[PDB]
Design a protein around this ligand. Structure first.
Ligand SMILES: [Mn+2]
Ligand SMILES: [Zn+2]
Length: 252
């Protein structure tokens, strides 16, 4: 089982496992699945970067996370034999929660069992308490990697701080850099630096990287993100990512 699935019933067991591994496998790749974008901000803003943040803020605050994928690697890009990736499945209620009906349809066709999420879905507050104590955050020794990172980190921040996201991007960025002092945004790298526009899967296809698991599920996407990072690091950066790219978020 290259993919370890996590529900409320084995949350502690799985976080313990990740904790025992993080020192030997200090690169964390993450992806998230949430109920889509439901609405856009109306009015006028300070900028396009500001427009993007307000869009993120409104949506992250209102819509509940459905999955988070975490894939661990060592610095050479090797995964632990224990697991290629973890898939954390969170509590969600189709009768009671806000979502775009289209996103739900896509996730269902993607394999998600919304019944199980309602029954044994993880509470984000429980996950966040363990994540905070895990050694994965607040530690400059750990590298976080994400494709399109505003949404991913925002959902973690939301779970960890248990308060609304900062009104302004500058403060959001400050907090983000506290909990995730060392991070790379693959979207920023691919598009803003290397001028390549393609999406996760497209990029994946060119690099002939084989997907493990279903598309649109966080565990699989997190693994794919890891493999894309290390291949790009190797092909275009000769072994080491440029430090000027650290903590640079795409579109913000
Ligand atoms: Mn993503
Ligand atoms: Zn995803």
């Amino acid at each position: 089982s290259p993919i370890r699935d996590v529900w409320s019933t084995n949350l502690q067991q799985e976080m313990n496992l990740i904790m025992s591994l993080i020192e030997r496998y200090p690169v964390v790749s993450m992806d998230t699945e949430f109920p889509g974008v439901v609405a856009r901000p109306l009015g006028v803003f300070k900028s396009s970067d500001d427009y993007h943040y307000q869009t993120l803020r409104a949506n992250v605050d209102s819509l509940k996370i459905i999955q988070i994928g975490l894939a661990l690697s060592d610095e050479e890009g090797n995964a632990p034999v224990e697991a290629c990736t973890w898939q954390f499945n969170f509590t969600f209620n189709l009768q009671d929660d806000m979502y775009a009906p289209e996103s739900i349809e896509l996730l269902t066709k993607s394999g998600i069992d919304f019944k199980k999420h309602q029954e044994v879905g993880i509470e984000p507050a429980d996950f966040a308490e363990l994540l905070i104590g895990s050694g994965l955050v607040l530690q400059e020794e750990v590298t976080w990697i994400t494709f399109h990172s505003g949404y991913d980190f925002a959902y973690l921040l939301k779970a960890m701080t248990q308060i609304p996201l900062p009104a302004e991007y500058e403060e959001f960025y400050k907090i983000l850099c506290i909990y995730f002092p060392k991070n790379y945004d693959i979207k920023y790298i691919m598009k803003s630096v290397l001028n390549n526009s393609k999406g996760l899967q497209d990029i994946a296809d060119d690099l002939q990287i084989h997907r493990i698991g279903p598309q649109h599920q966080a565990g699989s996407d997190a693994l794919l993100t890891a493999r894309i990072f290390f291949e790009i690091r190797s092909r275009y950066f000769d072994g080491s990512i440029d430090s000027r790219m650290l903590n640079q978020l795409y579109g913000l």
